Design a protein around this nucleic acid. Structure first.
Lengths: 174, 214, 51, 106, 124, 19, 187, 117
RNA sequence: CUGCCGAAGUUUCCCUCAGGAUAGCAGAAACUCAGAUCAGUUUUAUGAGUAUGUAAAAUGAGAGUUUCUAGUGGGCCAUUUUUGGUAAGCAGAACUGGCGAUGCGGGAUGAACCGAACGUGAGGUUAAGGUGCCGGAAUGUACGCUC
RNA sequence: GUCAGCAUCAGUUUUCGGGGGCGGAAAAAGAAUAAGGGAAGGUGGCUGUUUAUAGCCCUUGUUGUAAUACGUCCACUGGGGACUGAGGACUGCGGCUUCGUGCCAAGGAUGCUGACAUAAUGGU
């Protein structure tokens, strides 16, 4: 279960550098400790600030501001593969920012067999405008007249018993 | 007779007073740490809390197929058997101590409860080169009387607060022999904790693990 | 001497023997009231709900 | 006709075993009706008997009973582990057992 | 396909801690997640999947994304309560439910009840 | 390390993203 | 858990029904399967044929061809048939063609965990064991179909007599004044 | 204190069953690939010191008396002190005349005789 | 018969010849300091070229010595560079371990793989591996791809 | 003698439950109730529009000194199940006493009861 983590930190001040700059990141991690590790990985690969000369000023967790409000999320990501660079931009519609990323990890490791270390999250944004949406299935899901029977009819009501070996009647499933 | 009764009473009164002195400091410690963040967050200013002088390290890998460089380190931290775990002074000379055997130990910062339970339920003192349990405070005093440590709580206080006599106290504590955790580990236990394993620095989560290991 | 080790965290008599302060401890402290002073920096809240 | 049977039927499935080692010390009992590991918490501690017969007419009865106790739940589906006074013989795999309702807890 | 996922259809949750409580679909998040609510204080609004629920025949008109208060107003106005109970489907559930919390004495009275019912066997 | 305050005046934090 | 049970096999999956059956046999339950012709296998008809012509190609074995003998082979692979525990579990499993008379008067239960409709995505290719084996060397496809139709006539006729009979007791049920007390107890 | 025996079955030499020339008496194997010496699965168990019984209940019959072998009546007079912990056992070659003298003397002294018959 | 302890599996040299060695590992006896004496460890300080050696606090441990008396000086597997190589293997060292004296769980089966070092039993709980059936353990939950 | 049944305990242990602190955005929500803003996947109205004969979103106030989740903690409590009962005069460490007394879950199990001896355990 991932969590939103606003991670802010800076390098260790010294006589050469008395006032380091406060960097900020909104990165996801199952716990506080993983957030630090991803932070150092994200920053060191980019800004080249050493681990031992860095301290972290604040770790905060951001609950979803309006979880009950359905939203469409735009997710810029960078695939790492045999080549190692792919500007992929996926879109998911759900209620929680964390939930969208979970599915994005679900789809990336399913459709494309990606790995958490390999995939680096670029930017997660809300898509408030249907015109801003670019996916036909999301566009169709955003239509005023949505209507469809509950798919996978068997998955509804399933069998509904503890251990129902040898049911005495056929299941309707309709 | 009466003289030792007075000695018993006054000494027992002293131990109660010391214990209440420590827990009063204990509660005061968390209170300010809450007020520090509360004041900083109210101002929009950012506050970093003090460093940990206490580290608890549990050996999670067996004695088979371990490099000699890592074997010696385990000998120094007295983790001669799987599931053993000792209190170490979290300092700079222990940073690399736990980097060389990084895959073989999980270590993290213990809170008060974890330090309390371990000594109360698993507290054995190395006395006369023997593993004698801390059944009473006289055992500690007969061993740690010089360092003004009398009862278990004084010993717990000297450990938690990491006092001047941290070395002698933690050296007097026989390496706690813990049980394989109730409920088990993660599936791939031998990967780094940050990567979904259970080795290495897990920070506070040792306090979420040692409960399983008792 | 010490034929057995009785668990101090489960045996009250052993607990009192080891720690003569557990008698009067009073864990759950009513330090606060209903009057919780919610204190959060507005700029902290803004930078929290950023992006 | 149905004025008896104050017990609950069961079956002696097998021994609590590793892949290649049987531990005959404790058996596995599937109570007819138990369907969860939280469910077996009720049947823990009850007394379970395995009723068999033999040609010898000891005290005017060919029928013998081997006593036992439900000890703990086994697995996620509601089987339990039982510790009988005499380990149940290996030939009763699949045979029928009775988990009588006493000692009660209600 | 009389069972039709429609904004405002009544649903009956069959899995999870809220099993058996009625509620109405409010907004369709996706084909695997949905937002439902009920005026009953025991049911807080939450995002529930489609695996734990079975669709019911009763459908009440409901604008999309209505708050709980508006939904409560719409439900009370449309007297959906006791309209679900009008169905023969409903009457069996509490009949199963009432039999659940019976005791031994209630069971014996039922034995008296059914025995007195069967003795007639009067057929022309 | 010792506890201290990191003043944010004229040191405002701007968010970062990878490249 | 009755001593003897009958499993209708129409619409059940051969592999997933056998795994359920093999366990019940080792539990000691006398399981009898009926209508083994109408079993199903995942995969289009011609595929399951070729996997069967490999079986006939494997030769020194006795490639039993009847649909019951196909299912019995499936169960024999999930039992320890070398040992006397499984050798005595195999003999309880009686798999038949259609429904012999001593079982057509018995209630037939179905396994929810291995029905075709609950286990196959709609539109998936599948084959019927009865049709498959009749194209491998079975010679009794037509006779069992004719016999099954005849029993269906008698069984359907039996229901109509029972349907009217229960209707009479259905009509006379409300005459009992205890129905109000029945409602109060939810029964 | 009662009796518990850590093992009842005897120790039989390996392959003692297979051969009549191999005695039924324990000899420790010396082969360097001997599965018996290497303690494999399902192999016979080698005697160890771990099997040794309780010191307080060692050399004790299931009735808690240590068997003292008696040859004449002057040996039974020695068990006078220890009637509560030693059981007098008649030697197997004592004649019928002496045997009854010992049993009658032991009965008078309250010393149990293991093989009084 | 039981018990305790328990290696080396290799340098060193001498050596026409086979070897002989000194040393190391394993022991037994007789004697110092209660040590800042050691450490298959890392620091502190460096100096020179992220590494390198050096000397000078953390941690653990009681550390020592002179004297003799055995056994041993094979090989296999895998890593690091590595120079020489090509259809492709390779070829060569230096280096590091483990097996060699070692049962056990898993990998269907197994010399080197994954776990784990073994008195005799009881309960609890795990590792690696796993939970359709043979087979102990969810015909689990969730989201997806494939005919 | 052998074997059962239960009770109170001690050691280890597993399993459900209740109550209460403390921390987080002093949880986010949400509800109810006052402002302002905006629109739609546009409702009543007339394809186009701005709460009307549905409503929705955003900002603030207020009910708030809100609930809950989640994390942590109680030397807070209710139970249920299993294995073990080593040691054998008294010392000791403690707690309630009653200041002689004693008592106690505090330096390891005792009490009550039943059944069998042609049996039940145990051994070959």
């Amino acid at each position: 279960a991932l969590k939103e983590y606003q991670v802010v930190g800076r390098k260790v001040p010294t006589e050469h550098e008395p006032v380091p700059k406060l960097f900020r990141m909104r990165l996801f991690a199952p716990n506080e400790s993983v957030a630090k590790s991803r932070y150092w990985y994200f920053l060191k690969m980019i800004n080249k600030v050493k681990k031992a000369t860095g301290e972290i000023v604040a770790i905060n967790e951001i609950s979803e501001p309006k979880p009950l409000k359905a939203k469409v999320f735009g997710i810029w990501i960078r695939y790492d593969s045999r080549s190692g660079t792919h500007n992929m931009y996926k879109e998911f519609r759900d209620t929680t920012r964390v939930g969208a990323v979970e599915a994005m990890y679900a789809d990336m490791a399913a459709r494309h067999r990606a790995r958490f270390r390999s995939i680096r999250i670029l930017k997660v944004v809300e898509v408030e405008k249907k015109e801003d949406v670019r996916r036909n299935y999301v566009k169709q899901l955003l239509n005023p007249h949505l209507k469809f029977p509950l798919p996978h009819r068997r998955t509804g009501v399933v069998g509904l018993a503890g251990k129902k070996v040898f049911a005495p009647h056929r299941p309707s499933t309709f | 007779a009466a003289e030792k009764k007075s000695a018993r009473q006054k000494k027992r009164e002293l131990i109660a007073k010391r214990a209440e002195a420590y827990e009063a400091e204990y509660r005061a410690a968390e209170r300010e740490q809450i007020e520090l963040a509360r004041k900083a967050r109210a101002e929009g200013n950012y506050f970093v809390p003090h460093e940990p002088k206490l580290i608890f390290v549990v050996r999670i890998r067996g004695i088979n197929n371990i490099p000699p460089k890592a074997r010696k380190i385990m000998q120094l931290l007295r983790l001669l058997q799987i599931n053993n775990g000792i209190f170490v002074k979290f300092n700079k000379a222990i940073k690399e101590m736990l980097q060389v055997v990084e895959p073989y130990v999980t270590y993290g910062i213990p809170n008060h409860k974890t330090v309390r339970e371990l000594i109360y339920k698993r507290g054995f003192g190395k006395v006369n080169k023997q593993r004698i349990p801390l059944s009473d405070n006289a055992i500690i005093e007969a061993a740690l009387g010089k360092y003004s440590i009398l009862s278990v709580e004084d010993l717990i206080h000297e450990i938690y607060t990491v006092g001047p006599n941290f070395k002698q106290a933690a050296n007097f504590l026989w390496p706690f022999k813990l049980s394989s955790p109730l409920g088990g580990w993660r599936e791939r236990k031998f990967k780094h904790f940050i990567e979904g394993g259970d080795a290495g620095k897990r920070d506070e989560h040792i306090n979420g693990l040692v409960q399983k290991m008792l | 001497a010490h034929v057995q080790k009785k668990n101090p965290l489960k045996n009250k008599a052993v607990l009192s023997r080891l720690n003569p302060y557990a008698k009067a401890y009073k864990a759950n402290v009513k330090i606060n009231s209903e009057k919780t002073p919610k204190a959060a920096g507005e700029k902290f809240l803004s930078v929290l709900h950023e992006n | 006709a149905q004025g008896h049977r104050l017990y609950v039927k069961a079956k002696h499935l097998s021994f609590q075993r590793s892949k290649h080692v049987i531990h005959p010390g404790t058996s596995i009992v599937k109570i007819e009706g138990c369907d969860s590991k939280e469910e077996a918490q009720f049947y823990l501690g009850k007394r379970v008997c395995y009723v068999y017969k033999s040609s010898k007419a000891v005290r005017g009865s060919k029928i013998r009973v081997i006593w036992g106790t439900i000890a703990r739940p086994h697995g996620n589906s509601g089987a339990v582990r039982a510790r009988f006074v005499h380990n149940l013989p290996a030939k009763t795999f699949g045979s029928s057992l009775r988990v009588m309702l006493y000692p009660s807890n209600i | 396909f009389k069972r039709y996922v429609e904004v405002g259809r009544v649903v009956l949750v069959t899995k999870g801690e809220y099993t058996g409580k009625l509620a109405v679909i409010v907004d369709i998040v996706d084909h695997k997640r949905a937002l439902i609510d009920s005026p009953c204080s025991e049911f807080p609004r939450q995002v529930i999947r489609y695996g734990s629920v079975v669709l019911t025949h009763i459908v009440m008109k409901l604008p999309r994304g209505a708050r709980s208060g508006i939904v409560a107003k719409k439900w009370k106005a449309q007297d959906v309560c006791n309209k679900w109970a009008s169905s023969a489907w409903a009457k069996k559930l509490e009949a199963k439910k009432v039999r659940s919390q019976l005791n031994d004495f209630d069971r014996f009275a039922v034995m008296r009840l059914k025995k007195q019912r069967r003795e007639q066997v009067n057929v022309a | 390390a010792k506890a201290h305050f990191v003043s944010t005046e004229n040191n405002e934090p701007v968010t970062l993203h990878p490249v | 858990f009755q001593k003897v049970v009958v499993i209708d096999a129409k619409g059940h999956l051969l592999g997933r029904l056998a795994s359920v059956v093999a366990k019940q046999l080792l539990g000691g339950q006398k399981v009898v399967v009926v209508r083994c012709e109408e079993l199903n296998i995942s995969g289009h008809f011609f595929r399951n044929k070729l996997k069967y012509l490999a079986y006939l190609r494997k030769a020194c074995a006795f490639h039993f061809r009847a649909p019951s003998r196909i299912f019995q082979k499936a169960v024999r692979g999930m039992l320890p048939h070398k040992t006397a525990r499984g050798q005595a579990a195999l003999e309880h499993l009686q798999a038949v063609e259609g429904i012999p008379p001593p079982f057509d008067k018995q209630k037939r239960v179905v396994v929810p965990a291995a029905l075709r409709v609950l286990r196959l995505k709609p539109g998936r290719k599948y084959c019927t064991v009865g049709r498959l084996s009749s194209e491998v060397g079975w010679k009794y496809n037509d006779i069992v179909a004719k016999l099954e139709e005849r029993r269906k006539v008698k069984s359907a006729a039996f229901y109509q007599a029972k349907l009217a009979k229960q209707k009479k007791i259905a009509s006379a049920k409300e005459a009992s004044p205890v129905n109000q007390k029945l409602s109060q107890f939810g029964y | 204190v009662n009796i518990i025996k850590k093992r009842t079955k005897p120790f039989k030499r390996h392959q003692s069953d297979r051969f009549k020339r191999v005695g039924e008496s324990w000899r420790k194997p010396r082969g360097i690939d001997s599965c018996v010496r290497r303690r494999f699965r399902g192999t016979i168990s080698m005697p160890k010191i771990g099997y040794g019984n309780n010191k307080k209940t060692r050399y004790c019959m299931p009735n808690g008396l240590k068997a003292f072998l008696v040859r004449n009546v002057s040996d039974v007079e020695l068990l006078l002190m220890h009637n509560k912990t030693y059981a007098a056992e008649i030697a197997g070659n004592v004649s019928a005349r002496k045997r009854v003298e010992i049993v009658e003397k032991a009965r008078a002294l309250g010393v149990k005789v293991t093989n009084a018959g």
